C-alpha cells in the first residue's frame, strides 16, 4: 500500500491509496490512510485502515493534552519529538509519514515539512520536496522525481500527488489504483497557513479521471 | 493468476488473466497463458509466460508425434493419459488446466471436456461444467456457480468466462482485470467440432466494456 | 465454521453456521455462535459454542457496566472502542460485531458491521455484507452476486441463509442445515426497535426454499 | 474419504464415497474410488480420483497380463500377492481395500473376500466379516458392528454398506453423505459366483433415501 | 549494477553500467557487461566481468556453431530457445538479450527484447523497454516517463543513458557517469545494417548533457 | 557511511560524508552526521541521521546539565567518561567518535583530542594524529597515512580531511562522495582555542571541487 | 596480546606489549595494558586499552576506598578476595595478571607476588617465579623458563620480561614487538619495597635494542 | 598475506611478503609466493608455501605441454584461459605477465586477477593486490603509482605497497632486518621474466625504513 | 603426543616420544612413533602406534617399488612429492614429519632435510634448522630456539632433541617424559651421508639422566 506526501509553494499536500491485503486478497477497497492529528499535521500509515486510524488518533490525543496543559502548543521539533517517541515505543510493524507546516518558520513559501521513519524507528526530515512510503514508494518516488518540477501550487502539487500513487499502482498490485466503477479513490490531506483541511472527493476523482484519459490517449500513440 | 473453463452446449471455452508476478511487484501485463495444443484441445497454466507456453509446445508436440507415427491421433483418453505422463514427470509449479473437444463422443452438446490437476499431479474430468486454476479460482468458481445458468451457448460461454476471470481480479491482486488504458484483455480459445480456434481480441473487449457498464 | 452478517434498508442481520470440528470429525451439530449482546448489537464468533459465548457474555457485562455506572449506553464508536481493547486482549477466533446507531442522521443506513483482522484490528465495512470464519470467502462471492436482491428484512435474511449454504457447499467445516434433524443456522435482526433473535420456522422456511431451488 | 466392504452369504459387496478435499475444501463430489478390477475383485482406494482409477488400472493390467500369457487367471492367493507387489514398490499415503470372491473355494457361501492394507503395506484378510480404510473407517466399522447381525444376502449386504458410508459421513467432515440435491450417491460394487458388477446408481439411491427417511 | 535495453523505429539500443561491487567496495569500474554475440544479438548480464564475458562467449560459439554446421543462421525464436537451454542449465545469472529479427514482415518493429525471471523463464517484452539487475526498478521507472521522447537511434540511446544514469542516482550498486576517470556505459545499438558498438565520445556527449540538465 | 578526523597542530578536525543506504538503495543524500556538542567538542556516528542527533543532543543535554549544577565545565577525561557510560547504556548499533579540544592542557598544539569507541563500548584515544569510523574506514585511514605529513594547521588538515572521504566514497559504495549535481558536499567541525566552529559549506565546495579537478 | 610478570630477589616486574587487533587488522599500536593500581600493586590484562584501563581504575578506587573507611590498607590476601569478586561479578573475556608486594611478608627477599585467573575466575598465585597470559602467553612462559637462571635483580628481571614479550612477538601475530620506526616499546611496571614505579620508556628503549642487535 | 602487482613503463612486477600463519601463530618466514611459470608470465598466490609452488607448478607443466605439443606458445587470451578452467576445476591467483604480440611494447604488460567465484579480471588501474593486506597495499599504491616511471621505481612502490600492507595487517610480514629475509619480486619484460636479486629487494626495504624513521 | 627433528652440520636427527592417550588415560607407554624408511629417510607422526607404523610402512613400500621399477632411487623432491600425494590422499587425524639426507645436494654438512605437512596436507620444507609435531610442539620449537646455537655435531644435536622432547613433556601432559622407573626413553633416528641408523636405546637414556641431573 503506498502514502505520499510533497512540498508545494506555500504548504504540503499528503494522500494515500485505499487498499488492504491479506496475501494476495483484497481485504479493503475503502482504507482511509491519511488522518489530521491537529491544525497544521497531518499522519499517513501504510497498514491497515485500523493501524492507520488508531495510530493517528493517539497521536492526535498527545498533541492535543499539551496544549490543553501548556495553553500553546508544541513546536515542530517538539511534535517530531514526541512522534518518535510514540514509534519507538511500539516496536516492542508499518512506519509513519507525517506531513506538517510550521506556522513559526521564517520563510513561509517553505514551511511545509516531511517527516519521515526507517526500520530502526528513526525519523528523517526529507529535503528533496517530496517522499513515499509502503510497498509502492520506490514507483511513487521515481514517479515524482520526473514530475516535481511541474508543482507550482495546491492544485498542481495535489495532481502529482495522485499520479505518484497511480504509478505506484500501476506497478505494485498491493496499491490500489483508482475504482472508476464503484467510485473510490486516493484521499488526501492538504496543508497550508490556513490549516490542515480534507481534499474533497471531487477533485480528487477528477484528477484521478484526468490522469486515465491522459495515459491512455499516450499509449494510443506510441503504439 | 487465473485460468477458467467452462463447457457449453456444442463445446469447451477457455480463457485466462495477463498478469504476472514477482511478489508484490507487476511484472507482466501481456502474458499468454492459453494455448491451442491440436485441432481439438487447448491448455492453460497459471504461471510465468514461459512455463505456460513451454509446457504447452511439449505437449503439442507430443500430441503430433503420435499422430504423424500412427496415421491417426490419439483417443481423449489417450491425451490425458500423455498428459499426466508429463505432468508427473515435471514433478521431480504451476497445475495444468485442459480443455478439449471429444470428436468420438457419442453425444456432440455435451462433447466438451475439462481436465484438471491437483498438487500431486492427479488428474481430474470436471463434471460440475466449469473449473478454475490459479491464486484466484475460488472467485471465479463461486463467480460461475451463480452465472452458469446463464450459459446457453458460445457467445454466453464466452461472456461467463470473461466475468469470471474479471471476478478473479476484482478480489485478487496477483489476477490481471481488463486493462482499458493499455488495451489488453484476456485471452481466448473455444473449441467446437469444427476445431479449436482463438477468440479476436476485439470480441473479448466488447465483453469486457458490458460487464464493467454493467457493474457501474 | 462460517458467521455472514449484511446491511438492509432499515437494520443489519446477522447469521451463524451450526457445526463445529475437532480436526475431521463433527463434534458438534447445535453450536450456537451468534448472540445479541445489548438492545442494539449482537456478536458472531466462528469458533467453539464456547468461546462465542464466552465472548458475547463477557462483552455483554461490559456494556451494561457502563450503561448502569453512566446512566446512558456508550456511543456506537465506544462500542467497537471497547470490544476491541477486548479482543487486543485476548490475543496476547476473531469477532464480526452487527449493530445499529440509534443516534446516525439517516435511519435506512444506520445498520453497521464491524470486523477484525488477524492482528485484532477493527474494520467498519462499507460494501453493505461481511463474513468471517473458514467458509467466509464463498459466502462473500455468493452475497456479492445476491446482494442487488436485498430490499427489506426478510428478502436480507434470505440471502444470509443462502450465503451460509454457499459456505457448506464448498467448505467441510461449515454446516450446512439438517433436514434430519431440524436444525438450521441461528439469526439475529437488528433495526430501530432493537435486537431480537429470528425465529427457527422462518430459517426454516427460508434453507427449505433455497434447497428446492437448486434442486 | 471411506470406503467399506462386507460379506454376505454368497458373496462381497465393496463401497465407497464420492468426496475429496484440499484441506478444508470440498474439491470433488463426483469422485468414483471402488473399480472392478477382474472379473472377481474390486479395488478401493480411500485417496483421490486419480489414485484411485491409476492404481485399479494398473492391477487391472496385471491380472489380465499373466491371464493371457498363461492361459488361466491367478489363484486368488496370487491376486492378493500381485496386489502387495505393487502397494510396497509404490510406498518406496493411501492405502487399498480389494474385496474378492474365491471362484475355487470348496464353500461358495463364504468365498467372499476382503484385504487390506496397512501404512507399512502389510496385507490383512478380515475375517471380522467386514472392513473400512479411510478417514471416517472407525465411525463405519462400528456402525457395521450392530448392524452385521442383519446381514442374509446380498440387498440386506448392500443397505448395511450404504448405512456405514452415512454414518462415516455424519461424523466425519472429509466423507461425503448422499447429495439429495444434485443426486449423488456413494458407488458400489457386488461380487458373487457370476462376477462382478456394479450396482445401479438407482438401487443405491433407494437405499440411502429408507436410511434418511428412517432417521427423519 | 543495471543493463537497459529499449526498442526505437528502426531497432534496438542495450547500455550497461560499469561498477561491480564485493558487498559495499567497489571492485571494478571498467567492467564490460554488453556483449556482440553475432550479426544481429547483443546480450547484456547484470554481474561481474567474468560471468558476462564468459556467458556472452558461450553464447556467440553456439550461434556461429549451428551457422557453420547448417549453412544458415537461426531464426529468432532458434536462438532464444538456445540462449534459454543454456540459462537452465547453469542454473542446475540472468541475462537480457537484445536483437533484429532480420525475417520480420516490418522493418521497424524487428527490435527484440528478452529477459529471464529467477526459475530460468524467458519473457519477450512487448512495453518497449526493459532492465535488469539492482537498480533496474529505478531504470524501468525513469524509460516508462521518457520512453514517448525515442524517436530515433540516437534519442533511443539518450533515454537509455537517462535510465542507467536514474539507476545510480538512487542505487549505490549502479555507477554513474565518471567525469574524473573518463569512464561511461557502454552501448550497443542494433539495425537493419547489423549491430555496432557505440562509440565512446557519443555516450559521453550525451552523459554531459543529462548531466549539465540536472545541475 | 564515513566519519574521519584528524589532530592538526593547534586543533582537531572532524568530518563526514552525506549519505545513508537502506540495503543498496540510496535513502539519504543531506544527511548531517557530525554535531558539536559544546564549546569545545563535536560527536560523529556512521549511521542514520536520527541516530547522530539523538547522540548527539543527549550528549549536548548530559554536558550542559553538568555545568548548569556545579559551576564548571567537566575536565576532558570527564567528558569521555560520560560518553563511555552513554554507549554502554546503549548497547544493553553505530559507535561514535569524538573530536574535542583539551582547554587545560599543557601543550596547547596538541591539545586536540580524538575519541573513538569498539565493538564493546570501549574507548580509545588515538594517538596516530587521525581516525575514522564507519563502512570506508579502512580506505580513509590508508589515505590519511599518506598524506598525513602534509597537515601543519587548520587548512591542511581540513584538506586532507576531505580528500579521506572522497577515497572512501570512491571505494566503498555506502559512502557519499561530493555531489557536484547538486551541490552537497561533507559536514566538518573545526575545534581549536577559540572553541568549535562549523566549517561553512563554501569552504568545503571549495576543497572538494579541486580534489576532482586535481584527479582529473 | 601478551602480559608477562616475574619475581625478582626484592621483588616483581609486569610488562604488556602494545598491539590491539581486531581480527586480522592492527587497530592499536600505542595500547597500554598494564597500570599500578595502589601503592604496591599493579594489573595487566591482555585486551583492549579500555578493558585495561576501566579493569585497573575501578580496581584502585576500590582499594583506596577501603583504606580511607579503615584507616589501613587490605592485607594483600584481602586484595586478591576483593579482584576475585570483581572478575566473577564481570564473568557472570580476558583474565586479569595481577603482581603486587606484600610489604607484611616475613622474607622481603620473596616478598614479589604473581595472581593469575583461569577462564572460570579462578585465582592462582603463581609459584614457579613468573606467568603469561593472552594470545601469546605459551611462547613467552617457554622463553622465560630458559632465560629465568638469569634473573637475579631488578634489571634482569626486566630485561627478561621485554625478551619474553619479544619471542611472544617472534612466534605470534596478535602480540606486538617493539617499533624501532615509531620509537613505541613495551611498557613495564616495577615494584620492590620502595613501592610500584613506571619503568621509564628511554630503559625499555635500550633493553630492546640490544636484544636486536644480539641476535643480528 | 599479500601479494602486489604492477605494471610499469615496459613491463610489470609482482611481489609477496613471505608470511604464513596459522590462526594467531607465525609459521613461516621464507615462504615464497611467487613463482616464474613460463618466459613471459609469473603467478602469486596468498596462501601457504605448498599451494603456491604446487599451483605454479601445475600451471607451468600446463604452459609447456602445449608449447611441446603445438610448436608454439598459447596466446595471451590463452594461457589466462587455461588459468580459469584451472581456478574454476579446484574451486585466488594474480597473474604477472608480458604480451610478446601486443601492438605496443609500453603496454604489453598484464595483470589478471580471480574472485571469490573463481572469474578472471584484467586490471586496468595499473595496479593490484590479493590476500589479506590488499585493501591496505591497493591504497598504498594508489598515492604512489604516480611515481612509476621505470623498472626500478615500479619495484620500489611495489615493495612499500607491501610495507604499507604489513604495517596494518598482521597476517603480512615486514622485511625481518634481524633474519634478513625481504619480499620476493618477479620483473616481466620483452626480455622475459627474471627473478629479482635479494640485494636490490634488501637497498629498496632499507630505504623505506630510513625514510619513514 | 610429540616428534621434533634437527639439522646439524652434516645431517638431521629425528626423536619421538613413547606415550599415547585415550583421553585423559594413558593407554600406551612404549609406543615408537619414527620408522627409517629409506636409506637416506625417516617418518615421524604423532599419533597412534599402528597410525605412525602403517604410515611410515606404506610410504616405505612406495619408495623402494619405485627404485626396483626404475633402478635408481627417487631425487629427494621426488620423495617428498610422493609423500604429499600419500597425505593428501588420507585426508579426503596427525601429519607427518620427515627427516632425509640429500645425497645429491651441492653442501654436505648442509645436506639435512626437514619436512613437515600443515593441516591442509600441504608440504613445507624448514628452514629454521629444526621443527616439532604434536600437542607438545611449541614447547619443543621455544625449547629448541633458545638451545640451537649448542648444536655442532650428531651429539650435541640428540642431546638438544632429547632436551626439546623433556621440556614438551613437562609442560603438556599428553606427551610422555623418560621413565627412569621402566627404563623407557624416547626413540630416535640419525642420518648423515653413511644413512639413517637407528639411535642405540643405551645413548638416549645416558643424555636423558644427565639432563635430568641437570634439571634437578
Redesign the interface.
Given at each position: 500500500x503506498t502514502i505520499v506526501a510533497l512540498k508545494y509553494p506555500g504548504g504540503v499536500v499528503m494522500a494515500g491509496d485505499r487498499?488492504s491485503?491479506?496475501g494476495?486478497?483484497?481485504?479493503?477497497?475503502?482504507v482511509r490512510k491519511v488522518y489530521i492529528t491537529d491544525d497544521y499535521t497531518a499522519t499517513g500509515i501504510a497498514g491497515?485502515?485500523?493501524?492507520a486510524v488508531?495510530f493517528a488518533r493517539l497521536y492526535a490525543v498527545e498533541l492535543e493534552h499539551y496544549e490543553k496543559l501548556e495553553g500553546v502548543p508544541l513546536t515542530f521539533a517538539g511534535k517530531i519529538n514526541r512522534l518518535?517517541i510514540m514509534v519507538r515505543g511500539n516496536l516492542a510493524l508499518a512506519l509513519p509519514l507525517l506531513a506538517g507546516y510550521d506556522i513559526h518558520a521564517s520563510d513561509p513559501q517553505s514551511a511545509g515539512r516531511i517527516v519521515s521513519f526507517?526500520?530502526?524507528?528513526?525519523?528523517?526530515?526529507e529535503?528533496?520536496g517530496y517522499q513515499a512510503v509502503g510497498?509502492g514508494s520506490?514507483?511513487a518516488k521515481?514517479?515524482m522525481?520526473?514530475?516535481y518540477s511541474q508543482v507550482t501550487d495546491g492544485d498542481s502539487g495535489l495532481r502529482v500527488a495522485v499520479e505518484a500513487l497511480y504509478?505506484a499502482a500501476?506497478?505494485?498490485?498491493?496499491t490500489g489504483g483508482p475504482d472508476?466503477?464503484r467510485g473510490i479513490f486516493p484521499t488526501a490531506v492538504i496543508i497550508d497557513a490556513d490549516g490542515a483541511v480534507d481534499v474533497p472527493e471531487s477533485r480528487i476523482a477528477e484528477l484521478a479521471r484526468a490522469i486515465?484519459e491522459s495515459?491512455?490517449g499516450?499509449?494510443?500513440?506510441?503504439?
Open positions: 487498499r491485503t491479506q494476495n486478497m483484497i481485504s479493503g477497497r475503502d491497515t485502515a485500523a493501524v488508531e518518535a526507517d526500520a530502526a524507528g528513526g525519523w528523517n526530515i529535503e528533496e510497498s520506490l514507483f521515481s514517479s522525481k520526473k514530475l504509478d500501476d506497478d505494485d498490485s498491493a472508476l466503477v486515465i495515459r491512455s499516450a499509449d494510443t500513440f506510441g503504439s
